[PDB]
Amino acid sequence: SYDRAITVFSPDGHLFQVEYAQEAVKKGSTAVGVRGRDIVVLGVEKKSVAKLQDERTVRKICALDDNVCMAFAGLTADARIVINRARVECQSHRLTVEDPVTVEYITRYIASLKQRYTQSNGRRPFGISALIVGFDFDGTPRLYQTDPSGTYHAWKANAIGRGAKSVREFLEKNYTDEAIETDDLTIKLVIKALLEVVQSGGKNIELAVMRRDQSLKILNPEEIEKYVAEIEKEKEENE
Amino acid sequence: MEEGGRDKAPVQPQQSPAAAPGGTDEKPSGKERRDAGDKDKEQELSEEDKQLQDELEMLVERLGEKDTSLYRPALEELRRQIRSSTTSMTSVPKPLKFLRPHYGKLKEIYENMAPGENKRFAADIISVLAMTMSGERECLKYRLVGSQEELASWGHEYVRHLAGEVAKEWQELDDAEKVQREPLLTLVKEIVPYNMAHNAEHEACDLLMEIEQVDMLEKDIDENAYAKVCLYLTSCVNYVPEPENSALLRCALGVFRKFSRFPEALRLALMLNDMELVEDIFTSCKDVVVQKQMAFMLGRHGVFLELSEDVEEYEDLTEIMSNVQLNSNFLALARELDIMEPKVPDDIYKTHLENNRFGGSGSQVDSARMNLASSFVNGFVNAAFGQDKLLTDDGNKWLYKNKDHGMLSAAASLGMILLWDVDGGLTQIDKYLYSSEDYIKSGALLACGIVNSGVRNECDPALALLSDYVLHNSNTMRLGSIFGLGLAYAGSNREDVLTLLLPVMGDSKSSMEVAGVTALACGMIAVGSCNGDVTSTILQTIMEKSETELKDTYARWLPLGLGLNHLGKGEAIEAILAALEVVSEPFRSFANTLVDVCAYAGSGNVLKVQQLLHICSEHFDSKEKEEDKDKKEKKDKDKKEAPADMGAHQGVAVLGIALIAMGEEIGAEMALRTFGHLLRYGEPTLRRAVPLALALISVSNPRLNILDTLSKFSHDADPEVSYNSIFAMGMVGSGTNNARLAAMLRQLAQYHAKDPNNLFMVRLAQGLTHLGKGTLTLCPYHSDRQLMSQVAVAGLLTVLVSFLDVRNIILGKSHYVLYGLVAAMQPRMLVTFDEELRPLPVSVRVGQAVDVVGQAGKPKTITGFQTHTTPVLLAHGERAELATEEFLP
Amino acid sequence: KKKTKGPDAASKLPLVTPHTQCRLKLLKLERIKDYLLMEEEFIRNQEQMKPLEEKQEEERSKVDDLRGTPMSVGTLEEIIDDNHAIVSTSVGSEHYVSILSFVDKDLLEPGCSVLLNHKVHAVIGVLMDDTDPLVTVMKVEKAPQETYADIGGLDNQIQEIKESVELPLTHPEYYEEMGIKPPKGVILYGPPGTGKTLLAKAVANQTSATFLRVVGSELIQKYLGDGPKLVRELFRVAEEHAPSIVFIDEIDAIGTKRYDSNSGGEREIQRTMLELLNQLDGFDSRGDVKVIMATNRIETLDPALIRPGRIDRKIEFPLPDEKTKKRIFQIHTSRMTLADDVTLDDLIMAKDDLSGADIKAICTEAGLMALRERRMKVTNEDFKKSKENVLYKKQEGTPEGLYL
Amino acid sequence: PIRALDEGDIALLKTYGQSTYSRQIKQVEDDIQQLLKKINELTGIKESDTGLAPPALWDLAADKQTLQSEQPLQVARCTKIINADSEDPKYIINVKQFAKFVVDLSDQVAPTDIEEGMRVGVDRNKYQIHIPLPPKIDPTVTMMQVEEKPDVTYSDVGGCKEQIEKLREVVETPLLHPERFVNLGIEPPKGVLLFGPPGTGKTLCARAVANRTDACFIRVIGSELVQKYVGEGARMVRELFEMARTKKACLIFFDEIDAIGGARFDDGAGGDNEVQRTMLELINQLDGFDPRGNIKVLMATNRPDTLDPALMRPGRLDRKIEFSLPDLEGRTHIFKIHARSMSVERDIRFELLARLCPNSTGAEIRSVCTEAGMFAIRARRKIATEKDFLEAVNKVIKSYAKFSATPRYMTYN
Ligand SMILES: Nc1ncnc2c1ncn2[C@@H]1O[C@H](COP(=O)(O)OP(=O)(O)OP(=O)(O)O)[C@@H](O)[C@H]1O
Ligand SMILES: Nc1ncnc2c1ncn2[C@@H]1O[C@H](COP(=O)(O)OP(=O)(O)OP(=O)(O)O)[C@@H](O)[C@H]1O
Ligand SMILES: [Mg+2]
Ligand SMILES: [Mg+2]
């Protein structure tokens, strides 16, 4: 109505185009992530393989460096563009200053890049929301979550994608004030968080972990079902 | 046209039957192998239940009909094997072979011979293979055979054995809801000899299981709502042993057999008391069973538990008789003071306060009768020990002002002001009793008798009141002294009090009202036996009423007392006896229908109602039988108050149109009594019908009839915004609704609407389905039946105690041994389940929940939680022990 | 006293609670039948045994003959003098007629219909009521069969509408104590085939006041002056009666944005809409009348019909979620014979876009397909064929997952 | 493939599991409904609706004078006269439904008091003039006027100070203190139009002025004027104004002028053009010569842009008052008005609520108040509290037509 341009103000002061691109993220597959005392783990679902093409070129989680991880939602090509730009930026920073890249610096850089496609006309805003997970500052973990508008925040347990609200609802009650040790218990929490897959195929979950120490670790489809079995075993204790 | 590529069965199973007559002929190979090859196919196709168009029956019926007709009768060489096979393979097709006229052909094949067990291939099929047509045959052919020739051939013995095996089959095929159709056959087989069905089904359920009986019990108990009287009694008595024989619960036997005390048989109640003393061995199973035995069914049972264990095993009788009554009074005091009850409200009369500005100014009411009605309002609203100290001195000044009759009524108001009191109510009355005034003394005696009414203990049976009775020097100071006694021993049929009150009517006093009150007292003292009272009453009627032709006070006390003395019996022999006793002139024949209907308190008999409406139908009644039609309409509500609630609505439909629109005297005058007696809940249907034809008095008709409609306006207890109507009617009651003719009526109605917040309930329905007693008094109160001019004077003596069968409102109470627990439950609407396989939700609206000892309310079902196990009666009794048991780790 | 409750309900008795081939139902309907026959017999005897009759007082026939046999009906418009009023006939021809006696000269009022003679044309009576057979026909008197038991679970909406239309009647003690006026207007909006008319039926089934039902594109006549007058008479007859309720269905045929254009017929439509809009909430009073108004698309309505004060509660009916589908399936197949094999879990969970009417059609199609091969019991494959083979028209969007 | 159910299969289908009480049931319902039909037919109605009086009132007058009243009098149809020939005894008359005839007087009537232009009674046969009649007073216009006092006070309108001042200036002051205008030398206007968004608060102000008016008030139905017959709307318009002029100090109030007419277009052949005439009959009657005087007219509408510009001529409509959404003190005052008659917790502040409803009119605030009451009812409470209003606000104002509810003010912190 009063929109259709990226630099106009509605009578009550909104930027309707940014808001319109805001909802475009929720069309993607959900993904969550949490941090722990020793381990940080992020999980993705809704892979829904088409069983007739290879799956090594459909990656959704990528490492911006050797000691940081990122996940995304929304459409695809913009994600690839941002990934490439971020990798170049972090490597250049390591070149100009010998210290490694802190998890906060690269997030702020991504925020600035997404910010600078909003002021001018003739530039369509990016349509993705990112999750950054790292621990690089003296062995301490953190995660951050960004927005298509260009503002970042610090969380402890987030959820994005189609239907993140229910995952929230689950999280704010099931996440415990108990500072979570025993990393396997954190992974159990992540599995039970993704348990609300809209169809629960059992084999539509994928995890990635990072234990303050080593590079990326990827789970394989043999411990996922043992975790499922242990979840059923704990759940059968209803009486 | 679908035939071809598969119909080889219409080829080979067509040639085999075609030469089957040849098999019965010289070739025994067809007699054996072909019979086997047909029977095996038939059994296989009717065995499975997957294809409901049987592929063998439906390709044979056309030829198979004549084949079976000409095979069995034209064989003449019936060997066991060949004839058995023929009967087996010609008995099954008949359901498809013939049409509805098949009752004469259920046996044309099966009866020829019994091949083994007919249920062997008819064992696990529910209502498909054979049990449907077998059930139909046993239902109808057996009844036709046993209509008069009950003792006959196999049609009784072997039919009995077949019924037993078919009941076993109904249980063993699927054990499904078709079990509730097994009682059908039980009531269709030996219709008249139902006993030999019901006992059989009892034994069959004895080794069935101890848990699958409850559904059968409920089905029978709700099938007993209406049937033949003898069938009703048989079904009730056969239900009685069911919770004992198969199941060993035996806890509801004491509750579901009190219902068979009066209606079933006096000896039935004797055996119920016998089983209640034989049982109750567990101490819990005695204090609960005795809770309802007094305050929920009737009195006169304080001496049946006085055996040689009278320390605690037989001291419970005195507890539940009167000591439990005192404890309940103390509880109903403490709880009421805890929740909602200020000492001296007296506001509802003063509620007409926003009208002070309306209609100009006040200072209009100066009527002396007003003071009477005011006192009655202040009495009725002040029940449940709402005593007013020195606030009743207004009644003392009015007692010293005017209205000697109003003085008596005001004096008697203190009876119901301090109700159900034993400590000091008599002491409070005694101070004003010695006042040297005849009316004051009579009112004091009435109040004293009212105070201990319903307690029926041995406190002061005849100490004070009877000493004045035996000194009946004054005409007025003689009736109430005896009349209250009748109320005081209403539940007691003690012959001592009966013969002691008989001399009141035998004194030949000039006061006919005294004789009437004595008749009322003797009627309301006993409701069962003692025909000698009936003989004495009838003799007094013959010797007195013959010489007089006065007001119906004769018809208001003699025939009413006669009906009360023989109330609630469907034998009709007592009805015929009293009928042939009093054949006389029509003014006395008014009592014929009264005594006829008083013995029909409640049952399903459309014959009875049909003759009830045919009797006073139109007749044009040119001042001939107006009293007869008046009692006919006043009683049409009776006999219909337990019709399974269909009859109530249908009756309201009939009365709303028939008598209301095309009526002259029975309609325009005595048509509001039936609504005033039909229900006491308060619903928009009747509350709308009444005012529309009532607030418009229709002065053209006997405008006083509209006044009657005012009284039944207050037929609803439990105060509500109904007031808002009558309040308005009060203002139009200044000019219209004549003050000198309807002011006291409107005021007493408005006092009855919001009368006593606690103890509001008064509907003679303790338990979901019980109405044992309490209708006795309520009948006399409503027995004014017009003649409100007479009521204006009589009521000052009568209306104070006219309705004195009030039970307390509240039913929800923990009722622990020390009353420890408070409450944990969810009150809700009435039941929402009858015969559901899925979970039974009794509580339609569980949203409502309270955790106090507070009131129950009329349309409320209560369920519990927090695992208290509530092992008393699980429904509601106001005195459940509810011991805890939670063996659930 | 007004015309009073004027209740509209047949509602004899519904207790067929066995809902099977049990004896209880047979005995109960036996009781119903014999009561009805009893009442019929009573009315026959009432009408057959009337012996009294004169009913003319030697003058009633005199008055009957003094007035003409084919009396006509006219419209009084003024009364200049006693015994010389002035009336008019249909064609607008006034006549300075006289007024005779035997006509209570109390209830006559300018605008009231009167009874006139032919030959001399004087006033001889007053016609008590005049309601055309377009408004009395709108009324209902036989309640529809459904009730709350059949609704598949809409607890929020049911509680809402109950607080709207039912609760102020039965228990009107709270509202006065709090000092609030209960709401009077309700809109039911949402996608098609969800249950908007079920609540109308269910409410009409169980109530105590008068019910009036009107469908949208019926308030329209072609004579340029009948629409608004018919609306006015509708509300007049509703208010003179009991605390009635009015149900206008498929509104959007009447109200849409009130813009300015050329044709005169559309001007008439706008004129009628605007008259109703005044009638609902205009000058002084409104009365004790509730209005329910149902539509399946709401954005195209005139902003003056929807503002609060005129319509106070709006109720959206959304598509069913997976909790409700089980309830719907349990209701619509209750009276069905059915086999131990089937499990409704697969049918309810496989799909995620369907409504109540769709479920009913699936049930009937599956049952019929079972009948096709000569059976009564229903199996799982029948339900599979019913769901997939028909009952699904399609749509497309978001191609090939641009989002991942 | 598939096959068609044959007769034998149909026969067997109605055969297995029928139960022993199938038809035995249905025949019952059948005859039930049939006897229902019968019992309802046997009932019809009764009337007793002729208005006959008690017989005592009839008296014996029925024979004496009612019988002697049919034959002596005549109908005497009533018409008007347009052009009285003077000194020439021929008159001209029109029935307004018939044609025009030349007619004369009767024998007994003087030819003096027969002033031209008034209603007369006329014989059916000879069309002679017999008696005069007073000018018509229209039956619908008699109850057109309110003759009643709605109980709404100036004290009950909050947040509209200026508009109340201007309306008072137009209506009340010239009717009570008519000296300031002649003292300074100005003339009082005679027409005010009201406009604003729907719900702003117009008709309420109109009702308020009809309480302290101390003068005749006339409510006018916008949709009553149009008629099925030709030539009716204009007639009622002129009757309205003449009857208004008869008495002194009467006010006129209109609603939805856009119903009667606010545009003029060509063609519209047939039915439409009639309404055109009607509106014209108003306009030329609204002004012209002979100042109307202390007769004031009010126009109120919600759709001002569709009005005929001829209405905005100086002299017809003089002042136009705009109603606007209340800013801040309007909201606090409106809350204070509608929430002084319900039980509330005594320590609640209303300015906080005034913040959280930025663009809202009086209707929405009133609905918020009642809604908070309902949420108090749902739980068993006697006195409503803070949280009640806080929840009702989310229920009403914002909830309808929301956007980005889940994103919320993520970017606006
Ligand atoms: N929740 C439900 N429970 C039971 N039946 C339902 C439910 N929802 C829908 N139905 C079914 O939907 C039908 C009712 O029609 P409905 O009220 O949905 O029409 P509507 O919304 O007025 O549609 P339209 O736009 O065509 O007029 C019935 O077949 C009813 O059984
Ligand atoms: N300033 C205000 N003060 C008090 N109440 C107000 C105010 N503004 C609006 N209202 C409320 O608005 C409601 C109706 O207002 P009103 O009838 O005047 O609207 P309107 O603008 O004439 O509408 P429409 O043009 O649609 O007829 C009333 O309940 C009134 O209390
Ligand atoms: Mg519909
Ligand atoms: Mg308005």
From Swiss-Prot, chain A:
- Cite the post-translational modification comment: Phosphorylation by ABL1 or ABL2 leads to an inhibition of proteasomal activity and cell cycle transition blocks.
Question: From the Swiss-Prot or TrEMBL record, what is one GO molecular function term?
Answer: identical protein binding
Concerning what turns on (or off) its expression, the entry says: Down-regulated by the ribozyme Rz3'X. Up-regulated in colorectal cancer tissues.
**One Gene Ontology cellular component annotation held by this UniProt entry:** extracellular exosome
A biological process (GO) of this protein is: proteasome-mediated ubiquitin-dependent protein catabolic process
Residues annotated as glycosylated: 129
Q: Extract the InterPro entries matched here.
A: Ntn_hydrolases_N, Proteasome_alpha, Proteasome_alpha-type, Proteasome_asu_N, Proteasome_sua/b
Compartment(s) where it occurs, according to its Swiss-Prot or TrEMBL record:
Cytoplasm; Nucleus
Keyword list, A-Z: Acetylation, Cytoplasm, Glycoprotein, Host-virus interaction, Nucleus, Phosphoprotein, Proteasome
Q: List-wise, which residues carry Phosphotyrosine?
A: 152
Pfam families recorded for this chain?
A: Proteasome, Proteasome_A_N
Q: Which residues carry this modification: N6-acetyllysine?
A: 226
> Among its keywords, does the record have Cytoplasm?
yes
The outcome of changing residue 152 to F is: Displays impaired G1/S transition and S/G2 progression
Keyword RNA-binding among record annotations: no
- Family assignment? Belongs to the peptidase T1A family.
Q: What does this protein do?
A: Component of the 20S core proteasome complex involved in the proteolytic degradation of most intracellular proteins. This complex plays numerous essential roles within the cell by associating with different regulatory particles. Associated with two 19S regulatory particles, forms the 26S proteasome and thus participates in the ATP-dependent degradation of ubiquitinated proteins.
Q: What is this protein called?
A: Proteasome subunit alpha type-7
Q: Which organism is it from?
A: Homo sapiens (Human)
Gene encoding it? PSMA7
Curated annotation (Swiss-Prot), chain B:
Write out the ranges of the annotated region (Disordered): 1-52, 623-645
For this UniProt record, the keywords arranged alphabetically read as follows:
Acetylation, Phosphoprotein, Proteasome, Repeat
**CC per GO annotation:** cytosol; extracellular exosome; extracellular region; ficolin-1-rich granule lumen; membrane; nucleoplasm; nucleus; proteasome accessory complex
**Where in the body, by tissue, does this protein show up?**
Found in skeletal muscle, liver, heart, brain, kidney, pancreas, lung and placenta.
Q: Where is the composition biased (Basic and acidic residues)?
A: 24-52, 623-643
Record-listed Phosphoserine modification sites: 16, 29, 147, 361, 363
Q: Where is this region: Required for interaction with UBLCP1?
A: 708-889
Q: Which family does it belong to?
A: Belongs to the proteasome subunit S2 family.
Q: What does this protein do?
A: Component of the 26S proteasome, a multiprotein complex involved in the ATP-dependent degradation of ubiquitinated proteins. This complex plays a key role in the maintenance of protein homeostasis by removing misfolded or damaged proteins, which could impair cellular functions, and by removing proteins whose functions are no longer required. Therefore, the proteasome participates in numerous cellular processes, including cell cycle progression, apoptosis, or DNA damage repair. Binds to the intracellular domain of tumor necrosis factor type 1 receptor. The binding domain of TRAP1 and TRAP2 resides outside the death domain of TNFR1.
Any idea what this protein is called?
A: 26S proteasome non-ATPase regulatory subunit 2
Q: What is the lineage of its organism?
A: Eukaryota, Metazoa, Chordata, Craniata, Vertebrata
Swiss-Prot record, chain C:
| Modification sites for Phosphotyrosine | 403
Q: Where in the cell is it found?
A: Cytoplasm; Nucleus; Membrane
GO terms, biological process:
proteasome-mediated ubiquitin-dependent protein catabolic process
Keyword ATP-binding assigned: yes
Which disease appears in this protein's record?
A: Birk-Aharoni syndrome: An autosomal recessive disorder characterized by failure to thrive, severe developmental delay, intellectual disability, spastic tetraplegia with central hypotonia, chorea, hearing loss, micropenis and undescended testes, as well as mild elevation of liver enzymes.
Its function, per the record, reads: Component of the 26S proteasome, a multiprotein complex involved in the ATP-dependent degradation of ubiquitinated proteins. This complex plays a key role in the maintenance of protein homeostasis by removing misfolded or damaged proteins, which could impair cellular functions, and by removing proteins whose functions are no longer required. Therefore, the proteasome participates in numerous cellular processes, including cell cycle progression, apoptosis, or DNA damage repair.
According to UniProt, the name of this protein is 26S proteasome regulatory subunit 4
Native organism is Homo sapiens
UniProtKB/Swiss-Prot annotation, chain D:
Modification after translation is described as:
Monoubiquitinated by RNF181. Phosphorylated. Dephosphorylated by UBLCP1 which impairs PSMC2 ATPase activity and disrupts 26S proteasome assembly.
| Gene3D superfamilies membership | 1.10.8.60, Nucleic acid-binding proteins (2.40.50.140), P-loop containing nucleotide triphosphate hydrolases (3.40.50.300)
Molecular function as annotated in GO: ATP binding; ATP hydrolysis activity; proteasome-activating activity
Q: Which InterPro entries match?
A: 26S_Proteasome_ATPase, AAA+_ATPase, AAA_lid_3, ATPase_AAA_core, ATPase_AAA_CS, NA-bd_OB-fold, P-loop_NTPase, PRS7-like_OB
Compartments, as annotated in UniProt: Cytoplasm
**Upregulation:** Expression is not cell cycle-dependent and occurs throughout the cell cycle.
Highest taxon, organism lineage: Eukaryota
Presence of the UniProt keyword Transport in the record: no
- Annotated positions binding ATP: 196-203
**Keywords from the named record:** Acetylation, ATP-binding, Cytoplasm, Nucleotide-binding, Phosphoprotein, Proteasome, Ubl conjugation
Pfam families given in the database record: AAA, AAA_lid_3, PRS7_OB
| GO BP annotations, alphabetical order | osteoblast differentiation; positive regulation of proteasomal protein catabolic process; proteasome-mediated ubiquitin-dependent protein catabolic process; ubiquitin-dependent protein catabolic process
Q: Which SMART domains match?
A: AAA
Q: Which CDD domains match?
A: RecA-like_PAN_like (cd19502)
Q: Which cellular component, as a GO term, is one annotated location?
A: cytoplasm
What residues bear N6-acetyllysine in this entry? 96, 402
Q: Where are the transmembrane segments?
A: none
Hey, which family's this protein in? Belongs to the AAA ATPase family.
How is this protein named in the record? 26S proteasome regulatory subunit 7
Q: Which organism is it from?
A: Homo sapiens
